[PDB]
Design a protein around this ligand. Structure first.
Ligand SMILES: CCCCCCCCCCCCCC(=O)OC[C@@H](O)COP(=O)(O)O
Lengths: 218, 219
């Protein structure tokens, strides 16, 4: 099949500046009929993709002329003359020259803003939950930028592994920040074995790692 | 305006089959080129195949041949996708789309169905438990609700019956090793309000007819 490779995987952009995204196909997209059926789509979270550019360079109806497409054979480029807030989401290249039709893996355009450190919060498990035989410990990283963040769980100074899961919000449309939750899950039997529960957060916005903790009880 | 309407969300067990529909509205269904494309968890687009209802023409992604069967009913203007021997990894949003006409036609369409969410799992319907994420420290405090151990997706969470939206973050669900989902919803509020203002998260899980209001208070 014709593999389509997109770069970069992520593109933080500041509104007003130009942007450019690349798509390479593992074989020529020039059809025997002379046309090149390479298209560009933009998808927003929770929605279907929407067509921006067809056959390399033709703007789909309604698409503003700040978008353009170029390239030939195997190498293709989508460009935005000056980025606007509305341009955010996942860009996919698409080929319909060769069956099976294929797609690139996507390039995510997000808003670049100044670095913002997370506000960190820890939540002990509730009495209610404990009664049912399980303990969830939640660590919240609120309103930070950029998305890269490290959360480590320490239980009585010991590093935890394989017992936590992380979840992340979509970039806030108004303040351009992310928020993140990390949830440590233990049996009630395992939770009452230890005292100190600690969430350690590493982020570009913080001078050094920040730790919130509680002692089981108090 | 041409529209494509797909059948409702499906929950299936491993090994079962499904058949989902894509209903067209407009004359000329027989000349359509209908494609099916699925999309995995915030992931890439996987092309399944294309069908022309006016002829025997079909083309299938080889990777799904003999799981997938595309068909069309010209009398009802409906296209169908059948998928046999479903696996957990077949969990995805399934779209039908009309994008192209015949080569040389000059036709570029961008008609997409609303998508059919398909969940494949051995799990049984179960409503969530809802636990408070209590605030503690005058600046701003965070609080929330942990919505644990439900199936299938989705749940909805509002605060104070939708009266509070500002500063709320409702995280995507994660699938636990038990096969049940879990999510948290948090809000940041003024510290000074904590003594006076009530905070209740309202959790609705339609697939189980579950409605839970959980009051979140300090201590
Ligand atoms: C006698 C043979 C008829 C049976 C053919 C049925 C299957 C047709 C498969 C066609 C795939 C079309 C993919 C595509 O990219 O279409 C673009 C066209 O929209 C417009 O083409 P153009 O821009 O006018 O060259």
């Amino acid at each position: 099949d014709v593999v389509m490779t997109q770069t970069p995987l992520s593109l933080p952009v500041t509104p007003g500046e130009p942007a450019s995204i690349s798509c390479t196909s593992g074989q020529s997209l020039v059809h025997i009929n002379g046309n090149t059926y390479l298209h560009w789509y933009l998808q927003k979270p929770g929605q279907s993709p929407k067509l921006l550019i067809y056959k390399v360079s033709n703007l789909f109806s309604g698409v503003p002329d700040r978008f353009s497409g170029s390239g030939s054979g195997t190498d293709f480029t989508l460009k935005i003359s000056r980025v606007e807030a509305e341009d955010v989401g996942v860009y996919f290249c698409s080929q319909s020259t060769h069956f099976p039709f294929t797609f690139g893996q996507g390039t995510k355009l997000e808003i670049k803003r100044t670095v913002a450190a997370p506000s960190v919060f820890i939540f002990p498990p509730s009495d209610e939950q404990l009664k049912s035989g399980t303990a969830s410990v939640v660590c919240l990283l609120n309103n930070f930028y950029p998305r890269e963040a490290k959360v480590q769980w320490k239980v009585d100074n010991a590093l935890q592994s394989g017992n936590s899961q992380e979840s992340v919000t979509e970039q806030d449309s108004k303040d351009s920040t992310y928020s993140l939750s990390s949830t440590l899950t233990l049996s009630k039997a395992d939770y009452e074995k230890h005292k100190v529960y600690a969430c350690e957060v590493t982020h570009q916005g913080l001078s050094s790692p920040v730790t919130k903790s509680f002692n089981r009880g108090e | 305006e041409v529209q494509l309407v797909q059948s409702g969300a499906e929950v299936k067990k491993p090994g079962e089959s499904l058949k989902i529909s894509c209903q067209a509205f407009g004359y000329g269904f027989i000349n359509y080129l209908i494609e099916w494309i699925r999309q995995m968890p915030g992931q890439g687009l996987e092309w399944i195949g294309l069908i022309n209802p006016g002829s025997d023409y079909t083309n299938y992604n080889e990777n799904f041949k003999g799981q997938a069967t595309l068909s069309a009913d010209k009398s009802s203007s409906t296209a169908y996708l059948q998928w046999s021997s479903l696996k957990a990894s077949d969990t995805a949003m399934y779209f039908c789309a009309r994008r192209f006409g015949y080569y040389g036609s000059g036709n570029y369409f961008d008609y997409w169905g609303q998508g059919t969410m398909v969940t494949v799992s051995s799990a049984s319907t179960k409503g969530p438990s809802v636990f408070p994420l209590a605030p503690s420290s005058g600046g701003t405090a965070a609080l929330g609700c942990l919505v644990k151990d439900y199936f299938p997706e989705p749940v909805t969470v509002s605060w104070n019956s939708g009266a509070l939206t500002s500063g709320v973050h409702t995280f995507p669900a994660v699938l636990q090793s038990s096969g049940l989902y879990s999510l948290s919803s948090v809000v940041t509020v003024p510290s000074s309000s904590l003594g006076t203002q009530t905070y209740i998260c309202n959790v609705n899980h339609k697939p189980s007819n579950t409605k839970v209001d959980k009051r979140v208070e300090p201590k």
